[PDB]
Write a protein that binds this ligand. Structure first.
Ligand SMILES: Cc1cn([C@H]2C[C@H](O)[C@@H](COP(=O)(O)OP(=O)(O)OP(=O)(O)O)O2)c(=O)[nH]c1=O
Ligand SMILES: [Ca+2]
Ligand SMILES: [Ca+2]
Ligand SMILES: [Ca+2]
Ligand SMILES: [Ca+2]
Ligand SMILES: [Ca+2]
Length: 901
DNA sequence: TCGCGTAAGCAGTCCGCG
DNA sequence: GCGGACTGCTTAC
């Protein structure tokens, strides 16, 4: 097999590399790597190395990496560019793995661990590590075993051994319901004392040294706690055994409001799953506790226990250990679903970066572009300082707030990357500038043609047409990967809908789910077999289909995010290829393209409808248009349609056969107008929306920019078994809106779009009547909470104190003196409830950590004083009044006598 | 919230508006 | 009351 790296580090003048050799074995080596860097040289000086602008460079070979670094400094002192890859480990990987890397995940040691620490005096600070580590569960991917390290004797209590037999039993048997599929994979090691536990953990770690290290909050908690605790007990040299090169560094992570410390373990790649989740999941969650996320992702119940966590070990050590094991397994279950580890490996090996660098599109693209240019003996420019400067973005059309009955939407495939490729936008393809006219003059095709030589953007920039830039070339490669995976995603989605249909008529049989590849549209034979399956088998197939869809979604959307991140990186000052000329070339072309095609679509439709000046495009945002189809439907007549699916088909055909050719013609003209390198503006139909045939549903409404709802029957070629709501921006989509309120508002919208005004009025009346019985957590607002200290004036709110911050200060006063009470963590999320006047908390709201029950110290008083009236008006009624006035109906039946009878 | 971009919405504070 | 200036937070793209 081909060799591949596992990790790479620079330590002084050595590269330390862990890798898999040609026999599939893990090895480590220290290499005295001599880097090269570059300087411009005379034309007379024959060379094979050229910078990206074609200027000749001489290569400078250094005796060692420190000399290379010192040379860069002196070049700055002189005031000359020092060219080349200054991150020497990326250069090392480029030299050592000068081929497309084929990796084998089965050889990569992926470790998932979690620790427990009993603490009676509040949160156990990792930087102090003053409490014993009393449990570690460490799952190893190569062994496929859960290694459980259990402390039996502690200053906080001596306990009995954990019982695997009780752990396996149902909770209804008094057990812990540790999943049966992992029971035989548990290797249980009890310890008489903490020193022997930790010494054994370190010997184990030595034997089975993680390459990828993950878990939940491991980077911010478990790793620093373990490192500092071992440091406290044994000394630094022992703690550094967590690094295979015995090198560690305290790294200070800074943000706007403060900083925190992590421990960098050289020769390990830490991918904390909470951070993978935040980057790759495209959720915004009210809470990021593992319980909350597990429930959300897996539909597993919360891990239940009595009393505070600080007393769990002494009261119920059995459960204590079982929950530590389950916590590790839940992360593995989330990854089986979401596949973020697989994603990180793919992207990291593609770029030839340290795997942990997948968190950084700047680093990822820097490496991709360096490797690409190096192949041609081209030399990358030095990174430079730039002041941060604002620049313009996308165009968003102001919609007329209204109901909109029939809507067809269209948008560009990978808009910004497509613009890059079409215009040929790249650092080295800049050809010059032209004299810009107002944007509207380009939109209306009255401005002078910018160039007869070069490919142009309406921001004034011109680009070469003879050759693709490195940015277009490399962005195309990732886009193509994205496109492949999106194909699989949509296939699994469509396959999912076939199963849902078949589920209307399940067979009374005992059979099995079919063995199929859900990434490909089911053949006729598979469809026939599905129609004969039991509900049981169908449901199992649906679950598998949806898991395949999720896998495709992860692969596609994060490749989309990477290529989109390159367009954004051009506008970030730390990017080697930062250039506002290029960043604004993209966005300004985008603005033009949307408004150009709006004009073209309106023109086309006015022509087919025989009108003038009618606005068929009602909305657009960045790269999208929403087209009113009322007139199209009315031209055949609603009476002519057999059912909902009939007019959906008719609009689908109209979009494909009439609209899309019209749009394509519009964009080809624009391409020629801008003299672009290649026409790549592909604006495909997204959604077909409308009320159910014969209903009083309104179909859709807009309240304003970035705020709308549609009842969608077909989305990017997926024809739904049941209509689906596409809701953007409205309170149903915001993590700040209470859970039960999102649900209620969604049902109000459903009724509006599908059933009409009377149905809406029915539901509102019921919700208003019953909501006071909703669980307090389900009706609490949510907010991130920054700058708690800034607004805290002796325990009370200072000037301009935000409402949620006020809530926290109230909480802080109410729990004062308690070290055991849960603390609100700066920068994390809180639940927020309003309080009625005259309450014992002395203020109008209280807040507490999100994803948790409020402490029993004050729960009863919070419940008694909760202001349901304010809660209802603020979170439910106010948004609903916005929706209904926009859509021109009433959520309450207006008095129009009779009545009178 | 360490790790790519801008546009733009709503809640809430403070305070004017005769 | 509500709007504008402003801070804070969150979402669409
Ligand atoms: C979603 C998203 C979009 N954008 C910008 C770049 C996108 O090309 C542009 C349009 O957004 P989208 O239409 O969401 O995405 P897309 O056109 O890149 O991909 P698709 O083929 O799935 O439609 O908006 C970002 O800069 N960051 C983001 O997170
Ligand atoms: Ca725990
Ligand atoms: Ca798009
Ligand atoms: Ca599309
Ligand atoms: Ca059947
Ligand atoms: Ca779009």
């Amino acid at each position: 097999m081909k060799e591949f790296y596992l990790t790479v580090e620079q330590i002084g003048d050595s590269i330390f590399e862990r890798y898999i050799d040609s026999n599939g074995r893990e090895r480590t080596r220290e290499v005295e790597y001599k880097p090269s860097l570059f300087a411009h040289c005379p034309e007379s000086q024959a060379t094979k190395y050229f910078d990206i602008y074609g200027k000749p460079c001489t290569r400078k070979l250094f005796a060692n990496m420190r000399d290379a670094s010192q040379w860069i400094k002196r070049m700055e002192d002189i005031g000359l560019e020092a060219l080349g890859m200054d991150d020497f480990k990326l250069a090392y990987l480029s030299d050592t793995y000068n081929y497309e890397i084929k990796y084998d995940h089965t050889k990569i040691r992926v470790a998932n661990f979690d620790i427990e620490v009993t603490s009676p005096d509040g949160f156990p600070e990792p930087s102090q590590a003053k409490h014993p580590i009393d449990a570690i569960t460490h799952y190893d991917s190569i062994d496929d075993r859960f290694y459980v390290f259990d402390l039996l004797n502690s200053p906080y209590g001596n306990v009995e051994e954990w019982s695997i037999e009780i752990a396996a039993k149902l909770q209804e048997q008094g057990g812990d319901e540790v999943p049966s599929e992992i029971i035989d994979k548990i290797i249980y090691m009890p310890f008489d004392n903490e020193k022997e536990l930790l010494m054994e953990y370190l010997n184990f770690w030595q034997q089975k040294t993680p390459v990828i290290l993950t878990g939940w909050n491991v980077e911010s908690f478990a790793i620093p706690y373990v490192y500092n605790r071992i440091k406290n007990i044994f000394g630094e040299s022992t703690a550094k055994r967590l690094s295979p090169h015995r090198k560690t560094r305290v790294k200070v992570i800074e943000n706007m409001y403060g900083s925190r410390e992590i421990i960098t373990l050289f020769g390990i790649s830490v991918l904390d799953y909470i951070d993978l989740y935040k980057k790759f999941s495209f959720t915004n969650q009210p809470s990021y506790s593992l319980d909350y996320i597990s429930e959300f992702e897996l539909n597993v119940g919360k891990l239940k226990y009595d009393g505070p966590i600080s007393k769990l070990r002494e009261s119920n050590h059995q459960r204590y250990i079982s929950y530590n094991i389950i916590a590790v397994y839940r992360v593995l279950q989330i990854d089986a679903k979401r596949q973020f580890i697989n994603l990180s490996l793919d992207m990291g090996y593609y770029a030839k970066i340290q795997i942990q660098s997948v968190f950084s599109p700047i680093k990822t693209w820097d490496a991709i572009i360096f490797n690409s240019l190096k192949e041609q003996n081209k030399v990358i420019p030095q990174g430079r300082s730039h002041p941060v400067q604002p620049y313009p973005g996308a165009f968003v059309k102001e919609p007329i707030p209204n109901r909109y009955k029939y809507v067809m939407s269209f948008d560009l495939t990978s808009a910004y990357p497509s613009i890059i490729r079409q215009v040929n936008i790249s650092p080295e393809t800049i050809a010059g500038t032209f004299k810009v006219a107002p944007l509207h003059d380009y939109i209306n095709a009255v401005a002078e043609r910018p160039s007869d030589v070069y490919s142009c953007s309406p921001n004034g920039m011109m680009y070469y047409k003879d050759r693709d830039g490195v940015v277009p070339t490399e962005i195309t490669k990732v886009f193509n990967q994205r496109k492949e995976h999106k194909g699989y995603m949509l296939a699994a989605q469509r396959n999912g809908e076939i199963i849902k249909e078949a589920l209307h008529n399940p067979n009374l049989s005992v059979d099995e789910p079919l063995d199929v590849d859900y990434r490909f549209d089911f053949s006729d034979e598979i469809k026939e077999k599905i129609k004969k399956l039991s509900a049981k088998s169908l449901n199992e197939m649906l679950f598998r289909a949806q898991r395949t869809e999720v896998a495709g979604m992860t692969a596609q959307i994060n490749r989309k995010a990477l290529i989109n991140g390159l367009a954004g990186a051009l506008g970030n000052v730390w990017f080697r290829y930062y250039d506002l000329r290029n960043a604004t070339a993209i966005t300004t072309f985008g603005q033009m393209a949307l408004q150009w095609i709006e004009r073209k679509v309106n023109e086309y439709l006015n022509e087919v409808c025989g009108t003038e000046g009618e606005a068929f495009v009602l909305y657009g945002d960045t790269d999208s248009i929403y087209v009113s189809a009322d007139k199209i439907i009315d031209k055949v007549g609603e009476s002519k349609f057999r059912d909902t699916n009939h007019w959906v088909d008719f609009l689908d055909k109209f979009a494909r056969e009439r609209m899309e050719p019209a749009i394509d013609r519009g964009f080809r003209e624009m391409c020629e107008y801008m003299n672009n390198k290649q026409h790549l503006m592909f604006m495909d139909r997204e959604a077909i929306a409308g009320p159910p045939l014969g209903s009083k549903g309104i179909g859709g409404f807009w309240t304003g920019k970035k705020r709308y709802a549609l009842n969608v029957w077909d989305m990017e070629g997926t024809r739904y078994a049941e209509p689906k709501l596409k809701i953007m921006g409205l309170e149903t989509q915001k993590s700040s809106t209470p859970k039960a309120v999102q649900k209620a508002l969604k049902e109000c919208i459903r009724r509006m779009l599908q059933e009409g005004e009377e149905s809406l009025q029915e539901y509102f009346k019921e919700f208003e009547k019953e909501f006071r019985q909703l669980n307090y957590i389900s009706i609490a607002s949510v907010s991130s909470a920054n700058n708690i200290a800034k607004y805290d004036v002796g325990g009370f709110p200072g000037p301009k104190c935000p409402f949620h911050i006020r809530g926290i200060l109230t909480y802080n006063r109410a729990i004062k003196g308690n070290i055991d009470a849960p603390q609100v963590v700066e920068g994390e999320k809180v639940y927020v409830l309003p309080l009625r006047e005259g309450n014992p908390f002395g203020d109008k709201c209280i807040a507490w950590p999100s994803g948790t029950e409020i402490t029993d110290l004050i729960k009863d008083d919070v419940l008694h004083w909760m202001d349901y009236t304010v809660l209802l008006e603020k979170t439910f009624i106010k948004p609903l009044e916005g929706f209904t006035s926009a859509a021109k109906l009433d959520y309450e039946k207006k008095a129009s006598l009779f009545d009178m009878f």
